[PDB]
């Protein structure tokens, strides 16, 4: 048995959807990310209200790719006035992350997990910065960690 994830009771988990493999590569290399304006606001609020009591996890997936590509933890609030044009298309600001898992996990492994906060759609049909309920997030994390 593996009961690790089933015992975490603090933490918030968001889907990250990127159009760009370049941005993913840059994020892994430099441990930074940037979302949309409303995406940045959502993550920032979750980071600041969490007050170090638990992690904010980011489950990354390239739009159209058919798989998730890894997991990172948010590691700073959003800095909204930073150098422009560092990403594939010319985004306002930056926050620190720490990538803790880089592995392709097919959507087939995950599509049976549905989000009650998103019309019961499969977690694999999420938009950028879709939040995941913690009990579903525990299931997703365990599948990602278990995939070979
Ligand atoms: C700048 C990183 C980023 N952030 C986002 O929210 N959507 C994307 O497609 C993407 N490449
Ligand atoms: Cl890894
Ligand atoms: Cl699919």
Swiss-Prot record:
Recorded superkingdom: Eukaryota
Post-translational modification: Ubiquitinated by the SCF(SKP2) complex, leading to its degradation.
Outcome when changing residue 12 to A: Slightly decreased binding to RNAs
Location in the cell: Cytoplasm, Cytosol; Cytoplasm, P-body; Cytoplasm, Stress granule; Nucleus
Domain YTH per the UniProt entry, residue ranges: 11-144
Tissue expression from the record: Highly expressed in induced pluripotent stem cells (iPSCs) and down-regulated during neural differentiation.
Positions of the UniProt region annotated as Interaction with m6A-containing mRNAs: 9-148
Result when mutating residue 17 to A: Decreased binding to RNAs
Upregulating conditions: Following heat shock stress.
Binding site for RNA: 17-19, 23, 33-34, 63, 87, 91
Function description: Specifically recognizes and binds N6-methyladenosine (m6A)-containing RNAs, and regulates their stability. M6A is a modification present at internal sites of mRNAs and some non-coding RNAs and plays a role in mRNA stability and processing. Acts as a regulator of mRNA stability by promoting degradation of m6A-containing mRNAs via interaction with the CCR4-NOT and ribonuclease P/MRP complexes, depending on the context. The YTHDF paralogs (YTHDF1, YTHDF2 and YTHDF3) share m6A-containing mRNAs targets and act redundantly to mediate mRNA degradation and cellular differentiation. (Microbial infection) Promotes viral gene expression and replication of polyomavirus SV40: acts by binding to N6-methyladenosine (m6A)-containing viral RNAs.
Family designation: Belongs to the YTHDF family. YTHDF2 subfamily.
UniProt comment concerning the protein's domains: The disordered regions have the ability to interact with each other and to 'phase separate' into liquid droplets within the cytosol following binding to mRNAs containing multiple m6A-modified residues. This leads to the partition of m6A-containing mRNAs into membraneless compartments, where mRNAs may be stored, degraded or used to transport mRNAs to dendritic arbors in neurons.
Subunit organization: Interacts with CNOT1; interaction is direct and promotes recruitment of the CCR4-NOT complex. Interacts with YTHDF3. Interacts with RIDA/HRSP12; interaction leads to recruitment of the ribonuclease P/MRP complex.
Full protein name: YTH domain-containing family protein 2
Biological source species: Homo sapiens (Human)
């Amino acid at each position: 048995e593996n009961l690790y994830f089933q015992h975490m009771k603090h933490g918030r988990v968001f889907i990250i959807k990127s159009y760009s493999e370049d941005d993913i590569h840059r994020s892994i290399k430099y441990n930074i990310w940037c979302s949309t304006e409303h995406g940045n606001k959502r993550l920032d609020a979750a980071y600041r209200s969490m007050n170090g009591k638990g992690p904010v996890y980011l489950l990354f997936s390239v739009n159209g790719s058919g798989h998730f590509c890894g997991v990172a933890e948010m590691k700073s609030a959003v800095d909204y006035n930073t150098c422009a044009g560092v990403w594939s298309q010319d985004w306002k600001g930056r926050f620190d992350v720490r990538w803790i898992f880089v592995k392709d996990v097919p959507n087939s492994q995950l599509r049976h997990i549905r989000l009650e906060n998103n019309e019961n759609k499969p977690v694999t049909n999420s938009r950028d910065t879709q939040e995941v309920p913690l009990e579903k997030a525990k299931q997703v994390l365990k599948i990602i960690a278990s995939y070979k």
